[PDB]
Design an enzyme around this catalytic site. Structure first.
Site, short mmCIF file in Angstrom:
data_model
loop_
_atom_site.label_atom_id
_atom_site.label_comp_id
_atom_site.label_asym_id
_atom_site.label_seq_id
_atom_site.Cartn_x
_atom_site.Cartn_y
_atom_site.Cartn_z
N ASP B 45 -21.84 11.89 45.72
CA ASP B 45 -22.84 11.80 46.77
C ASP B 45 -24.16 12.44 46.34
O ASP B 45 -25.23 12.00 46.77
CB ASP B 45 -22.30 12.42 48.07
CG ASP B 45 -21.18 11.59 48.69
OD1 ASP B 45 -21.23 10.34 48.60
OD2 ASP B 45 -20.24 12.19 49.25
N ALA B 159 -21.33 16.43 56.48
CA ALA B 159 -21.75 17.30 55.40
C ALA B 159 -21.99 18.70 55.97
O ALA B 159 -21.14 19.17 56.74
CB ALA B 159 -22.95 16.68 54.69
N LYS B 162 -21.01 19.56 59.60
CA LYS B 162 -19.60 19.79 59.90
C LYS B 162 -19.22 21.26 59.68
O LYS B 162 -18.51 21.85 60.50
CB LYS B 162 -18.74 18.87 59.03
CG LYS B 162 -17.22 19.06 59.20
CD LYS B 162 -16.46 17.96 58.50
CE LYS B 162 -15.00 17.95 58.89
NZ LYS B 162 -14.29 19.20 58.47
N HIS B 220 -30.95 17.71 49.05
CA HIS B 220 -30.76 18.65 47.95
C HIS B 220 -32.02 19.41 47.58
O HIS B 220 -31.93 20.44 46.89
CB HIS B 220 -30.21 17.91 46.73
CG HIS B 220 -30.98 16.68 46.36
ND1 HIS B 220 -31.21 15.65 47.24
CD2 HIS B 220 -31.57 16.32 45.19
CE1 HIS B 220 -31.91 14.70 46.64
NE2 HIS B 220 -32.14 15.09 45.39
N1 LIG Z 1 -22.93 12.85 53.95
C1 LIG Z 1 -21.89 13.49 53.44
N2 LIG Z 1 -20.73 13.51 54.11
C2 LIG Z 1 -19.67 14.14 53.62
N3 LIG Z 1 -19.72 14.79 52.46
C3 LIG Z 1 -20.85 14.81 51.75
N4 LIG Z 1 -21.17 15.37 50.59
C4 LIG Z 1 -22.45 15.09 50.32
C5 LIG Z 1 -23.11 15.55 49.13
C6 LIG Z 1 -23.58 15.99 48.05
C7 LIG Z 1 -24.03 16.61 46.79
C8 LIG Z 1 -25.41 17.21 47.06
N5 LIG Z 1 -25.15 18.03 48.25
C9 LIG Z 1 -26.30 18.65 48.90
C10 LIG Z 1 -25.74 18.85 50.33
O1 LIG Z 1 -24.74 19.94 50.38
C11 LIG Z 1 -24.31 19.99 51.79
N6 LIG Z 1 -24.17 21.47 51.82
C12 LIG Z 1 -24.96 22.47 51.41
N7 LIG Z 1 -24.36 23.63 51.73
C13 LIG Z 1 -23.20 23.36 52.35
C14 LIG Z 1 -22.16 24.12 52.91
N8 LIG Z 1 -22.18 25.45 52.89
N9 LIG Z 1 -21.12 23.48 53.47
C15 LIG Z 1 -21.07 22.15 53.50
N10 LIG Z 1 -22.03 21.41 52.98
C16 LIG Z 1 -23.10 21.99 52.41
C17 LIG Z 1 -25.47 19.19 52.39
O2 LIG Z 1 -25.14 17.79 52.50
C18 LIG Z 1 -26.61 19.41 51.45
O3 LIG Z 1 -27.59 18.42 51.75
N11 LIG Z 1 -22.95 14.35 51.32
C19 LIG Z 1 -21.98 14.16 52.22
#
Ligand SMILES: Nc1ncnc2[nH]c(C#CCCNC[C@H]3O[C@@H](n4cnc5c(N)ncnc54)[C@H](O)[C@@H]3O)nc12
Ligand SMILES: Nc1ncnc2[nH]c(C#CCCNC[C@H]3O[C@@H](n4cnc5c(N)ncnc54)[C@H](O)[C@@H]3O)nc12
Ligand SMILES: Nc1ncnc2[nH]c(C#CCCNC[C@H]3O[C@@H](n4cnc5c(N)ncnc54)[C@H](O)[C@@H]3O)nc12
Ligand SMILES: Nc1ncnc2[nH]c(C#CCCNC[C@H]3O[C@@H](n4cnc5c(N)ncnc54)[C@H](O)[C@@H]3O)nc12
EC number: 2.7.1.23
Lengths: 260, 260, 260, 260
Positions: B45, B159, B162, B220
């Site tokens: 992703d 993401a 949640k 990101h």
């Molecule tokens: N849309 C989505 N649905 C389900 N899983 C997903 N994984 C992704 C992705 C990816 C790789 C680049 N990630 C950057 C993104 O890290 C998420 N993020 C940052 N900090 C945390 C945290 N502490 N806990 C959960 N999340 C977090 C958020 O998305 C931020 O923008 N997108 C989705």
């Protein structure tokens, strides 16, 4: 036009109801509680809930209005001292209709029963462990173990749904929200944890695993349903209509009830 | 037609990219990374996020497709061993477009900057206490104290949103969801607690109280913004378009990533 | 020495019980279920709960041991295939006693009843709204509105308490933990929100506001108590004693049940 | 006896400090800020935190007292208008000492640094993903992914720990509590979710997975630690001592700050 007034039953609300009827007697207004076109509720959100379910079979012909006698409600958004200006405003008409979505609940046995909810519908077991399979649009999503589940309308998200961790969604969104009650999660049992928000036309279906007896609620009503094969939740085609005379935004209504 | 392929950069994804290009060489397909009409992303992703932001200025002319090399992603929903059938299917065309909503972020200083988010946008302070006034459609809603706030798109609710207690909402709902980060609540400080879900055309506005420096993220990317007077969140008029060749429902996609 | 064995009742547990009795027949071991000194439970944590409450009036003379036939329990921490080594180890003795704290529940009417809990004790209303005043060491702390309250022992924090957001506390801490069930919080109603952890000698007291009928649970038992004037929670002077033959730390036990 | 007074720095607190010094001038009291035996703090909990860390190397010879000038603090529990009665009461002595537990933080590199916390100690990454292995008494418990972790003292549970969902534990319990910050949980990543409460002598150890740079906080201090091999948390042998002149229970202190 035809109208009726329901009252919480205490001294304050009863004597307020009579004065508005006396005011309406000075206008082109007919009292009728069989076929009203305006339904005024005086009391609390519980009194409003009763007025809604009392007339739930003529929703597209009725505009609801709520007066709150001692708190401030989400559905009852007029002060008792503002009742006089309400009588006049109604008497002319040409006011505005705003509509909120409702939740349809269907219970199937081995005859099927349907219900309408303005706040929410919940499911628990009749004592003993609550276990159901959760099916979204004919696809198996999860096996839920816990105390129960709660499916909420948009305007109901500020009620039970809020106490369960659900999100408050604006009522212009045709959606329903399902929240968990004390879900058990370990290495073998696995639930999503999070609240789920479904659009129109999505059918969430609960199916028993062992026990087939559940305590099902719709707003304030709660019945023990025997020999249940399926409970079906979906956003109703029906909507509830409110008469509005002034701007009172939902987020302002949320602010006043929870912030200050 | 015109197409391009981005890769995560490891041995698996690079050599997968070359084989699909070799397959497309056997069809009426032109490689062009300046003006593609199909954008294929191979990786995770994070790689998909890069592909989206790389072409975010031609969204209504591009259909995205994601292949996941080592996990299963929410945006990348094709297996590496299914790449051959993907090449053929694309080569004909006449496929289907499905569109997800996006979030617009505006930052005003004392020149205004706008950003587009597919997952979410967050605000924290640049060290020190984070305090902002939250304003919904020009009306003051609450004074937030805590670690930060997170505004999520529908598809981003799975993401960061949640992990903050937010609800998962189906991407056919044109909405945005705001969640809290470690909000402080006592007798004097008061926040709503709950996630809020806003429809199109609702503007949520954050305004500094003392400090005017904030660390703002969009997906990101994360930049320290100096001398901030306003941050504005709203559902974007722009949408992201996906090419779909098979049924793969969102709730099935949620099931596979979190249940089993 | 004197010992007895309780069984879950299925084919696996019954025939396992008989083989251990046959093994004990080869040693200086007398079966007695009136005055045992070792109580072996074969089944699940529910079977262990029964064994505990069955002998709760001779706790300081009994050492409990649990065997789990199909899951792995928090109280039953021996595999069925390890039963033979268990028979031998017990037969010698000189083993070690470890003790966990228990919760005392007192219910007063207008004769007072006391109960002992190894997991937890909960209070809900018998249909209708649950409202109680919460009093800590004779000082009024809060007025609780919601679905109910849960007071947990240390070893019970991994049970219902966990599903309510409570913390897992190590059983060497003589404490009790109170958690909320769907507490309603708005501008007029106000609860602490958070779980509370009380030491020995602190008395938490629930007092009815209107309704005086409550559904009270202690572990697996649940009774509707009529005309209730007070419910009193405190850490019991009594403790439950376990025979241990090997190192199996609580956090390892938590790890295996919830992580992998 | 020897004493000193620290002040928040504003007009109210400074001029309050001078009047108490003038009062102490009428008694057998010597001002000394190198070796005080009574440390009076005038301001907020932040001012109290400073006074504690200022003298953290002579804890078993000092009794702290806090006056709050504009809120009410958990550590500062005397009103400004009650300062006169405080001067007299101190002047005699024979008062009572009550002691609260503290948290020891150890950071090891590839020289080891130790810190003392009265509220809590937290760990986050220095930008980028925070991933650490959590080890409890030399046994691997879980791999944490999220924003960070927070280890709290008993009296600190009403601070950051509370905003993270932690439980409020009475300060007579020699314990520490670890809470999660936006932990990511899916099919592949797995955290316990719940707060953990550890007794004396239990060592929780965080170990880097990839990145070895972390932003570590102890109360109000926050430093970026380079090349970190281990962070070790445990309940300190040291305790903080308070002079008490009147009954003011912790749960009363919790009530006044969060209920009304
Ligand atoms: N849309 C989505 N649905 C389900 N899983 C997903 N994984 C992704 C992705 C990816 C790789 C680049 N990630 C950057 C993104 O890290 C998420 N993020 C940052 N900090 C945390 C945290 N502490 N806990 C959960 N999340 C977090 C958020 O998305 C931020 O923008 N997108 C989705
Ligand atoms: N729509 C609304 N938004 C904001 N406040 C509102 N109050 C009302 C109302 C009313 C009087 C009749 N109540 C029956 C309703 O009790 C709610 N309820 C039940 N158990 C709980 C609980 N443990 N925690 C929070 N709620 C609960 C739920 O609504 C159920 O149906 N409606 C709303
Ligand atoms: N100490 C323990 N630690 C970790 N797992 C454990 N399993 C057991 C056990 C057992 C079989 C008999 N159960 C009765 C017990 O059902 C728990 N319980 C009830 N409703 C729920 C719910 N909605 N969510 C989680 N729990 C619930 C609570 O324990 C109640 O007393 N004991 C423990
Ligand atoms: N012990 C206490 N109990 C109840 N209230 C208290 N206030 C204080 C104090 C003070 C002024 C200096 N504060 C530094 C402390 O800010 C807390 N903190 C930081 N970020 C947050 C957040 N996002 N949400 C809640 N808290 C937070 C934490 O304490 C950190 O160390 N101490 C206590």
């Amino acid at each position: 036009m035809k109208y009726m007034i329901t009252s919480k039953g205490d001294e304050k609300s009863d004597l307020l109801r009579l004065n508005m009827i006396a005011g309406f007697g000075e206008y082109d207004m007919e009292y009728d509680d069989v076929e009203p076109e305006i339904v005024i509720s005086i009391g609390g959100d519980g009194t409003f809930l009763s007025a809604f379910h009392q007339y739930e079979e003529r929703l597209d012909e009725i505009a609801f209005i709520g007066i709150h006698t001692g708190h401030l409600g989400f559905y009852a958004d007029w002060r008792p001292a503002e009742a006089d200006k309400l009588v006049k405003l109604l008497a002319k008409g040409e006011y505005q209709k705003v509509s909120y979505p409702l939740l349809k609940t269907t219970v199937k046995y081995g005859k099927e029963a349907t219900y309408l909810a303005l706040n929410e519908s919940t499911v628990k077991s009749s004592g003993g462990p609550f276990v159901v399979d959760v099916v979204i649009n004919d696809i198996h999503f999860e096996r839920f173990r816990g105390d129960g589940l709660c499916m909420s309308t948009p305007s109901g998200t500020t009620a039970y749904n809020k106490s369960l961790g659900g999100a408050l969604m604006h009522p212009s969104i045709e959606a329903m929200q399902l929240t968990e009650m004390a879900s058990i999660n370990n290495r073998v049992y696995r639930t999503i944890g999070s609240p789920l928000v479904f659009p129109k036309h999505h059918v969430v279906s609960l199916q028993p695993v062992n026990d087939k007896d559940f305590q099902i609620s719709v707003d304030h009503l709660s019945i023990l349903h025997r020999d249940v094969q399926e409970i079906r939740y979906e956003v109703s085609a029906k909507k509830i209509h409110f008469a509005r005379f002034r701007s009172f935004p939902f987020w302002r209504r949320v602010h006043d009830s929870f912030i200050e």
